[PDB]
Structure 1
Amino acid sequence: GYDRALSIFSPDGHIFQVEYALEAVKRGTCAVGVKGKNCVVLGCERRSTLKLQDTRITPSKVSKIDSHVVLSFSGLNADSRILIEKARVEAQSHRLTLEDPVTVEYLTRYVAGVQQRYTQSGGVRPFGVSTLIAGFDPRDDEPKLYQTEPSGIYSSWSAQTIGRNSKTVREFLEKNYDRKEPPATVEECVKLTVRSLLEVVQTGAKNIEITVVKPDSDIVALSSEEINQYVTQIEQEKQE
């Protein structure tokens, strides 16, 4: 079998393949995650270079791993499918062996472990994907939001963004998001998520996707018109 060590240290103590995988994430469309008091919202950029697209059937950017946990990403689209499939299999495997669904932290730890494994196994390259994993633990009303990256490190975030121009939207979130008082309602949380993407997106038309996840497996994706109403209200307040 093909055993070639592709991910190796350089003289300065860097693993270039892992670092170049992060450059693939930088190229990917922007993804953002914001957790309110009783919800988490996942926002995703859709590049409008591709029209004539069939939006019914085109792979959506946010994926359900279980009924209570979702996963969004930035980077190589094909790579993300492998992580999503593995995560979905592990979720069912946990329910089967332990008789509880996965916690959000556990699912994150698993996906992050798969990514790490692909940085020191022979004959394989790292995943060119960073993920945002959000949801609610079974019988728990505390929001959960985690981030993973190609190296395999993971951590919890009050709010986070990944992908292209994520530096800019993180700048926005750092000055607009208050920890002492997070977005108290679904409205406020979605509004702040749309506002953050409007710093980077271009047109607020079909370029912004929003998915709201509430406790007890309550997950819904907002439509174009619903998002368009947020886009309208934001700029009308801005004209002042």
Structure 2
Amino acid sequence: YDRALSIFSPDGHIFQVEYALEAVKRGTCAVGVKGKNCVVLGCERRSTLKLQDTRITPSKVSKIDSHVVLSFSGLNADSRILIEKARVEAQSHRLTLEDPVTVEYLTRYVAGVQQRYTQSGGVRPFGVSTLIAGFDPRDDEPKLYQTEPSGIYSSWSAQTIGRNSKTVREFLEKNYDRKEPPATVEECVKLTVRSLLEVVQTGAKNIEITVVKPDSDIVALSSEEINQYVTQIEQEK
């Protein structure tokens, strides 16, 4: 094939990018807040449909390395195409220059993939938007980036993407303070959980939280831990 499927618009755009942005909104919702020493990406997980497994059904947040986690919102099918490249580039980094990836670098590469599919003949661009997070190796500053279909990436102190991202981000302007992150890791879990129960609702059976602490600690919380934070917050409120 060789025909353009991305073409210039008489306005100033490409219609496939605006369209792709519309695609991220019709997806499920992932939230990002970083603490003083943690990233937390939590995601809304479906359960309209029932008899769905929990062990074998893939999660919304897929560990690339031992220190770089990626979450995605938009088409759940497409997602796996951006991640397959992203994992192999991380092993190539280890090979050719040594040291594992820096979060800034992986975000720039992932951006370059979506960038390319906005301008190469015979592709549409990805309808999928990432929160790519993690730690730099031998450092402990939390890093939280979000890249989007344009092929543009932005760093964010806290961010949210997917359905009702404007509604959630409004919440986060009013409770997360740029100057003083949540004082500990635990305060940071209560913030991501506090945000989700606005839009997601319908029990703690939908809320997923992955927490990363520096020095290669990836833990994904159990349904019991989630219930516990939702309950506290419901009651206090």
Unaligned 5+ runs, structure 2: none
Residue-by-residue CA offset, 1:45-94 (whole Å, 9 max, x unaligned): 01221211011101111100101100001011111101111000000000
Alpha-carbon offset, residue 3 of structure 1? 0.8
1:140 aligns with 2:132: no
State the distance in 1 between where 2:5 and 2:176 align: 40
SS at match of 1:199: helix
Residue-by-residue CA offset, 1:83-114 (whole Å, 9 max, x unaligned): 11100000000011111111000000000100
Alpha-carbon offset, residue 8 of structure 1? 1.1
State the distance in 2 between where 1:45 and 1:168 align: 14
State the distance in 2 between where 1:50 and 1:137 align: 39
State the distance in 2 between where 1:6 and 1:48 align: 35
SS at match of 2:227: helix
State the distance in 2 between where 1:205 and 1:143 align: 26
Match of 1:54 in 2: 53
Residue-by-residue CA offset, 1:192-216 (whole Å, 9 max, x unaligned): 0000111100213221100001111
SS at match of 1:178: coil
State the distance in 2 between where 1:50 and 1:7 align: 35
Match of 1:31 in 2: 30
SS at match of 1:169: helix
Alpha-carbon offset, residue 144 of structure 1? 0.2
Unaligned 5+ runs, structure 1: none
Aligned length: 237
* CA-atom RMSD in angstroms: 0.7
Identity of counterpart residues, as a percentage? 100
Match of 1:205 in 2: 204
Residue-by-residue CA offset, 1:209-240 (whole Å, 9 max, x unaligned): 000011111110001010000000001101xx
State the distance in 2 between where 1:202 and 1:68 align: 30
Alpha-carbon offset, residue 180 of structure 1? 1.1
SS at match of 2:77: helix
State the distance in 1 between where 2:28 and 2:176 align: 22
State the distance in 1 between where 2:49 and 2:18 align: 28
Normalising by structure 2, we get a TM-score of 0.98
SS at match of 2:58: coil
State the distance in 2 between where 1:122 and 1:139 align: 41
